[PDB]
């Protein structure tokens, strides 16, 4: 499992959908449209293609 | 507890002469320090700790045991901003300012960008969990809200992440002055978030007015960052060096500017930009009142120069 931060279009992204690729939500930002998620390392590819997903960034 | 001294850096940034005007104890003003946490019961700090929060591992906690400093770095930085002016220990640049201690770094003094971004969000939201309660677009400086007016980040890294930048943009749009360490690698330019245009990059000088060799270059301003005595756990004091120690001197000067301005005018100043050289903006004021060391003008070692609180406050109130 790795921690990544996803930048999303709120109107088009569903946080429940991260379970579908084996991940879970850690924190949903109140001030920016982004969410911290834990996903399997091999799932970063799939996450990138999810509905409403604009960017996936590694935790630095 | 030892008898109070004024550390050399506090004298250097010309803070003591400001105190008769303000010590920063204007009720709408808070400084959020995003660091390793705080020794919240330290006798030379306690009275100024207004809120203690932790964002470690992406969970927000206001539990004292989660927000307590396990490293020392946060306690040291906070003491340079806000150590009390009394009979003991040391004294901060703004010895009456309220502090929000936001723990984004762990026992190691290491932290994730995710936890840092959450920390910035907590500084904007404040204890009430809402950025703009009355919906008027005024956040920093609105006495109806509880947002911080200064975010102080004695930390940095090499990555420029989009979400972290978006969070910096949100703080900047809330009217918050953002101050961050240039970094300690002797690099040609500052670390992030210092390197963002919305953020004041702070380099370190020593007590001879020489730039520290470790100090990352092209800062916006510089400040005392070598042989800095401050508070340290548990209820003690320690001397350290780094751009992490320079940062809080600048954050304190900002806190005095905004406190004095609100005390006189019932508003705060706009944050301003890197290029600003007017008296109409916090950063403009910092730049024109800084002690211009090295070559004339902004230079890659000192930035615009060493911050000076006494002159900055006079420029603000003039
Ligand atoms: Ca405030
Ligand atoms: Ca203590
Ligand atoms: Ca003291
Ligand atoms: Ca609030
Ligand atoms: Ca408001
Ligand atoms: Ca208001
Ligand atoms: Ca110069
Ligand atoms: Zn997890």
Coordinates of C-alpha atoms and ligand atoms in Angstrom, one line a residue:
Chain A
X1 CA 0.0 0.0 0.0
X2 CA 1.1 3.6 -0.9
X3 CA -0.3 7.0 0.0
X4 CA -1.2 9.4 -2.8
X5 CA -3.1 12.6 -3.2
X6 CA -5.7 12.8 -5.9
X7 CA -6.9 16.1 -7.4
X8 CA -10.5 15.8 -8.5
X9 CA -13.5 17.5 -10.0
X10 CA -15.9 17.3 -7.1
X11 CA -19.0 17.3 -9.3
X12 CA -17.6 14.1 -11.1
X13 CA -15.6 12.1 -8.5
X14 CA -16.9 9.5 -6.1
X15 CA -14.8 8.8 -3.0
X16 CA -16.6 5.4 -2.6
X17 CA -15.2 4.3 -5.9
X18 CA -11.6 4.0 -4.6
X19 CA -12.6 0.8 -2.9
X20 CA -13.2 -0.6 -6.4
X21 CA -9.4 -0.6 -7.0
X22 CA -8.5 -1.8 -3.5
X23 CA -7.9 1.5 -1.8
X24 CA -9.5 3.6 0.9
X25 CA -9.9 7.3 1.8
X26 CA -7.6 8.8 4.4
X27 CA -8.6 12.5 4.3
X28 CA -11.0 14.7 2.2
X29 CA -9.8 18.3 2.0
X30 CA -12.4 21.0 2.9
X31 CA -10.6 23.8 1.0
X32 CA -9.3 22.2 -2.2
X33 CA -10.8 19.5 -4.4
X34 CA -8.4 16.8 -3.4
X35 CA -8.3 13.6 -1.3
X36 CA -5.6 11.6 0.4
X37 CA -5.9 7.9 -0.4
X38 CA -4.1 4.6 0.4
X39 CA -4.0 2.3 -2.7
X40 CA -2.0 -0.8 -3.7
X41 CA 1.2 0.3 -5.5
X42 CA 0.1 -1.5 -8.7
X43 CA -3.2 0.4 -8.6
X44 CA -1.8 3.9 -9.3
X45 CA -2.3 3.3 -13.0
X46 CA -6.1 2.5 -12.4
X47 CA -6.6 5.5 -10.1
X48 CA -5.3 7.9 -12.8
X49 CA -8.2 6.8 -15.1
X50 CA -11.0 7.1 -12.5
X51 CA -14.1 9.3 -13.1
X52 CA -13.4 12.9 -11.9
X53 CA -9.7 12.3 -11.3
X54 CA -7.5 15.1 -12.7
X55 CA -4.2 14.3 -11.1
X56 CA -2.5 11.7 -8.9
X57 CA 0.6 12.8 -6.9
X58 CA 2.9 10.7 -4.7
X59 CA 3.2 11.8 -1.0
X60 CA 6.6 13.6 -0.7
Chain B
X1 CA 14.1 28.3 35.6
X2 CA 16.9 30.7 34.6
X3 CA 16.6 34.5 34.7
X4 CA 15.4 36.0 31.4
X5 CA 17.8 37.0 28.6
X6 CA 17.1 38.5 25.2
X7 CA 18.8 36.3 22.6
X8 CA 21.0 38.1 20.1
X9 CA 18.6 37.4 17.2
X10 CA 15.7 39.1 18.9
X11 CA 17.9 42.2 19.4
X12 CA 19.2 42.0 15.7
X13 CA 15.7 42.1 14.2
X14 CA 15.0 45.3 16.3
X15 CA 12.0 43.7 18.2
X16 CA 12.4 45.1 21.8
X17 CA 11.7 48.8 20.8
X18 CA 8.4 47.7 19.3
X19 CA 6.9 46.3 22.5
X20 CA 5.8 49.6 23.9
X21 CA 3.5 49.8 20.8
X22 CA 2.5 46.2 20.8
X23 CA 3.8 42.8 21.9
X24 CA 1.4 41.1 19.4
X25 CA -1.4 40.6 22.0
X26 CA -4.1 41.9 19.7
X27 CA -7.0 39.4 20.0
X28 CA -7.7 38.9 16.3
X29 CA -4.1 38.0 15.6
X30 CA -2.8 34.4 15.7
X31 CA 0.4 32.8 14.3
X32 CA 0.1 29.2 13.1
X33 CA 3.4 27.3 13.5
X34 CA 3.5 24.1 11.4
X35 CA 6.2 22.0 13.0
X36 CA 6.9 19.1 15.4
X37 CA 4.3 20.2 18.0
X38 CA 4.9 22.1 21.3
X39 CA 5.9 21.7 24.9
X40 CA 2.5 23.2 25.7
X41 CA 3.1 23.5 29.5
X42 CA 6.5 25.2 29.1
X43 CA 6.5 28.1 31.7
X44 CA 7.9 30.5 29.1
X45 CA 5.3 29.5 26.4
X46 CA 2.1 28.3 28.0
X47 CA 0.1 31.5 28.2
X48 CA 0.5 32.1 24.5
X49 CA -0.6 28.7 23.2
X50 CA -4.1 29.3 22.0
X51 CA -4.7 26.0 20.1
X52 CA -2.8 22.7 19.7
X53 CA -3.7 20.4 16.8
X54 CA -2.0 17.5 15.0
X55 CA -2.4 16.3 11.4
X56 CA 0.0 13.3 11.6
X57 CA -0.9 10.3 9.4
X58 CA -3.7 12.3 7.9
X59 CA -6.0 12.4 11.0
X60 CA -6.8 15.6 12.7
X61 CA -6.5 15.5 16.5
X62 CA -6.8 18.2 19.1
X63 CA -5.6 15.9 21.9
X64 CA -2.8 17.3 24.0
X65 CA -1.0 14.0 23.9
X66 CA -1.0 14.0 20.0
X67 CA 0.0 17.6 19.7
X68 CA 2.8 17.5 22.2
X69 CA 6.4 18.0 20.9
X70 CA 8.4 14.7 20.8
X71 CA 11.3 16.3 18.9
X72 CA 12.1 19.8 20.2
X73 CA 12.2 21.7 16.9
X74 CA 8.6 23.1 17.2
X75 CA 9.1 24.2 20.8
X76 CA 12.3 26.0 19.7
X77 CA 10.6 27.8 16.8
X78 CA 7.6 28.8 18.8
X79 CA 9.8 30.3 21.5
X80 CA 11.6 32.5 19.0
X81 CA 8.2 33.9 17.9
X82 CA 6.4 34.1 21.2
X83 CA 8.4 33.3 24.4
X84 CA 6.9 35.4 27.2
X85 CA 8.4 38.7 28.4
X86 CA 8.7 38.0 32.1
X87 CA 11.4 37.0 34.7
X88 CA 12.5 33.8 33.1
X89 CA 14.0 32.1 30.1
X90 CA 14.1 34.0 26.8
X91 CA 11.7 36.4 25.0
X92 CA 10.1 36.1 21.5
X93 CA 9.9 38.7 18.7
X94 CA 6.2 39.0 19.5
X95 CA 6.1 38.0 23.2
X96 CA 2.3 38.5 23.5
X97 CA 1.1 36.8 20.3
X98 CA -1.3 33.9 20.3
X99 CA 0.1 30.7 18.8
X100 CA -1.6 27.9 17.0
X101 CA 0.7 24.9 17.2
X102 CA -0.1 22.6 14.3
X103 CA 1.9 19.4 14.4
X104 CA 2.7 18.2 10.9
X105 CA 6.1 16.7 11.6
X106 CA 6.7 13.6 13.7
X107 CA 9.2 12.7 16.5
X108 CA 11.9 12.6 13.8
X109 CA 11.2 16.2 12.6
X110 CA 10.3 14.6 9.3
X111 CA 6.9 15.0 7.6
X112 CA 4.7 14.1 4.7
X113 CA 3.5 16.8 2.2
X114 CA 0.0 15.4 2.8
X115 CA 0.2 16.2 6.5
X116 CA 1.7 19.6 5.8
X117 CA -1.2 20.5 3.4
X118 CA -3.7 19.4 6.0
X119 CA -1.9 21.6 8.6
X120 CA -2.3 24.6 6.3
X121 CA -6.0 23.8 6.0
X122 CA -6.3 23.7 9.8
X123 CA -4.6 27.1 10.1
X124 CA -7.2 28.6 7.8
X125 CA -10.2 26.8 9.3
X126 CA -9.1 27.4 12.9
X127 CA -10.6 25.8 16.0
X128 CA -14.2 26.3 14.7
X129 CA -13.6 24.2 11.5
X130 CA -15.0 26.8 9.2
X131 CA -12.8 29.2 7.1
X132 CA -15.3 32.1 6.7
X133 CA -18.2 31.8 9.2
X134 CA -20.0 35.0 8.1
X135 CA -19.4 34.6 4.4
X136 CA -18.0 38.0 3.7
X137 CA -14.7 36.9 2.0
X138 CA -12.6 38.2 5.0
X139 CA -10.8 35.5 6.8
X140 CA -7.4 36.7 8.2
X141 CA -8.1 39.8 10.2
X142 CA -11.9 39.2 10.5
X143 CA -12.7 39.3 14.3
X144 CA -15.7 37.0 13.6
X145 CA -13.4 34.2 12.3
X146 CA -10.5 32.4 14.1
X147 CA -8.1 31.9 11.2
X148 CA -4.4 32.5 11.7
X149 CA -2.9 35.7 10.1
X150 CA 0.6 34.2 9.7
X151 CA 1.5 30.6 8.7
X152 CA 5.1 29.8 9.7
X153 CA 6.8 26.7 8.0
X154 CA 10.3 25.9 9.3
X155 CA 10.4 23.0 6.8
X156 CA 10.8 22.3 3.1
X157 CA 11.5 19.8 0.4
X158 CA 12.5 19.5 -3.3
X159 CA 9.0 18.6 -4.8
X160 CA 6.5 21.1 -6.2
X161 CA 3.2 19.3 -5.8
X162 CA 0.1 20.7 -7.3
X163 CA -2.3 20.1 -4.3
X164 CA 0.2 21.6 -1.9
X165 CA 0.4 24.7 -4.1
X166 CA -3.4 24.8 -4.3
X167 CA -3.4 24.9 -0.5
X168 CA -0.8 27.7 -0.4
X169 CA -3.0 29.6 -2.8
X170 CA -6.0 29.1 -0.5
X171 CA -4.0 30.5 2.5
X172 CA -2.8 33.5 0.4
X173 CA -6.4 34.2 -0.7
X174 CA -7.5 34.1 3.0
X175 CA -5.2 37.1 3.5
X176 CA -2.6 35.0 5.4
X177 CA 1.1 35.9 5.3
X178 CA 3.0 32.7 4.6
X179 CA 6.6 32.4 5.8
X180 CA 9.0 29.4 5.1
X181 CA 12.6 28.4 5.6
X182 CA 14.9 28.6 2.5
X183 CA 16.4 25.3 3.4
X184 CA 19.9 24.1 4.6
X185 CA 21.6 22.5 1.5
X186 CA 23.6 25.6 0.4
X187 CA 21.5 25.3 -2.8
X188 CA 21.1 28.0 -5.5
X189 CA 17.4 28.5 -4.8
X190 CA 14.9 27.9 -1.9
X191 CA 13.1 24.7 -1.1
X192 CA 9.3 24.4 -1.4
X193 CA 7.0 25.9 -0.1
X194 CA 9.5 28.8 0.3
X195 CA 10.0 28.9 -3.5
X196 CA 6.3 29.7 -4.2
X197 CA 5.6 33.4 -5.2
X198 CA 2.9 33.6 -2.4
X199 CA 5.4 32.6 0.3
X200 CA 8.3 34.5 1.9
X201 CA 11.5 32.5 1.6
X202 CA 13.8 33.1 4.6
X203 CA 17.6 32.7 4.7
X204 CA 19.9 32.5 7.7
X205 CA 22.6 35.0 8.9
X206 CA 25.1 34.5 11.8
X207 CA 25.9 37.0 14.6
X208 CA 28.6 38.6 12.3
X209 CA 26.0 39.4 9.7
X210 CA 27.5 36.8 7.3
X211 CA 25.1 34.5 5.5
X212 CA 25.3 31.0 6.8
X213 CA 27.1 28.7 4.4
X214 CA 24.2 26.2 4.6
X215 CA 21.5 28.8 3.8
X216 CA 19.7 28.1 0.4
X217 CA 20.2 31.1 -1.8
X218 CA 17.8 33.6 -3.5
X219 CA 15.7 34.1 -0.4
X220 CA 13.3 37.0 -0.1
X221 CA 14.6 38.2 3.3
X222 CA 17.1 36.9 5.9
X223 CA 17.2 36.6 9.6
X224 CA 19.2 35.3 12.6
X225 CA 19.7 31.5 12.1
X226 CA 23.0 30.5 13.8
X227 CA 23.6 30.1 17.6
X228 CA 19.9 30.8 18.4
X229 CA 18.9 30.2 22.0
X230 CA 15.2 29.4 22.5
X231 CA 12.7 27.2 24.5
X232 CA 13.2 23.4 24.2
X233 CA 11.6 20.5 26.0
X234 CA 11.0 19.8 28.7
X235 CA 10.6 23.2 30.2
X236 CA 14.2 24.0 29.2
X237 CA 16.3 26.0 26.6
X238 CA 18.6 25.1 23.8
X239 CA 20.8 26.7 21.1
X240 CA 20.4 25.6 17.5
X241 CA 21.1 26.8 13.9
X242 CA 19.3 26.5 10.6
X243 CA 16.9 28.3 8.3
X244 CA 14.3 26.8 10.6
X245 CA 15.5 29.3 13.3
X246 CA 15.6 32.2 10.9
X247 CA 12.0 31.7 9.8
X248 CA 10.2 32.5 13.1
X249 CA 12.1 35.8 13.5
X250 CA 10.4 36.9 10.2
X251 CA 7.0 35.4 11.3
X252 CA 7.2 37.4 14.5
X253 CA 8.0 40.6 12.7
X254 CA 4.9 40.0 10.5
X255 CA 2.8 39.3 13.6
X256 CA 3.9 42.7 15.1
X257 CA 3.2 44.5 11.8
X258 CA -0.4 43.1 11.6
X259 CA -1.1 43.5 15.3
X260 CA 0.1 47.2 15.3
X261 CA -1.9 47.9 12.1
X262 CA -5.1 46.3 13.4
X263 CA -4.6 48.1 16.8
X264 CA -4.5 51.4 14.9
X265 CA -6.9 50.8 12.0
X266 CA -9.1 47.9 12.8
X267 CA -7.9 46.1 9.7
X268 CA -4.8 44.2 8.5
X269 CA -2.5 44.9 5.6
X270 CA -2.6 42.9 2.3
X271 CA 0.1 40.2 2.0
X272 CA 1.7 41.7 -1.2
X273 CA 4.2 40.2 -3.6
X274 CA 7.9 39.5 -4.0
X275 CA 8.5 42.6 -6.1
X276 CA 6.6 45.0 -3.8
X277 CA 8.5 48.0 -2.6
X278 CA 5.7 50.1 -1.3
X279 CA 4.5 50.7 2.3
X280 CA 1.1 49.3 1.3
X281 CA 1.6 45.7 1.8
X282 CA 3.3 43.4 4.4
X283 CA 5.9 42.2 2.1
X284 CA 6.5 45.7 0.6
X285 CA 7.1 46.9 4.1
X286 CA 9.5 44.0 4.9
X287 CA 11.5 44.7 1.8
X288 CA 11.9 48.4 2.1
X289 CA 12.8 48.3 5.9
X290 CA 15.1 45.3 5.7
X291 CA 18.8 46.1 6.5
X292 CA 20.3 45.8 3.0
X293 CA 23.5 43.8 3.5
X294 CA 26.0 42.6 0.9
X295 CA 25.8 44.3 -2.6
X296 CA 23.3 47.1 -2.9
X297 CA 19.7 45.9 -3.4
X298 CA 18.2 42.4 -3.4
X299 CA 21.1 39.9 -3.7
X300 CA 21.2 36.0 -3.8
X301 CA 22.6 35.8 -0.3
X302 CA 20.5 38.1 1.9
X303 CA 17.4 38.6 -0.3
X304 CA 16.3 42.1 0.3
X305 CA 18.2 42.0 3.7
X306 CA 17.7 41.4 7.4
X307 CA 14.2 42.1 8.7
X308 CA 13.8 45.0 11.2
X309 CA 10.7 45.1 13.3
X310 CA 11.0 48.6 14.7
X311 CA 11.3 50.2 11.2
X312 CA 8.6 47.9 9.7
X313 CA 6.0 48.8 12.3
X314 CA 6.8 52.6 11.8
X315 CA 6.4 52.1 8.1
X316 CA 3.1 50.3 8.7
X317 CA 1.7 53.0 11.0
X318 CA 3.1 56.0 9.2
Ligands
LIG1 CA1 -7.1 35.6 13.4
LIG2 CA1 6.7 20.9 29.5
LIG3 CA1 10.6 34.9 29.2
LIG4 CA1 -12.6 29.3 11.4
LIG5 CA1 -15.4 36.3 7.5
LIG6 CA1 -16.8 39.2 8.9
LIG7 CA1 21.9 43.5 -0.6
LIG8 ZN1 -4.6 3.3 5.0

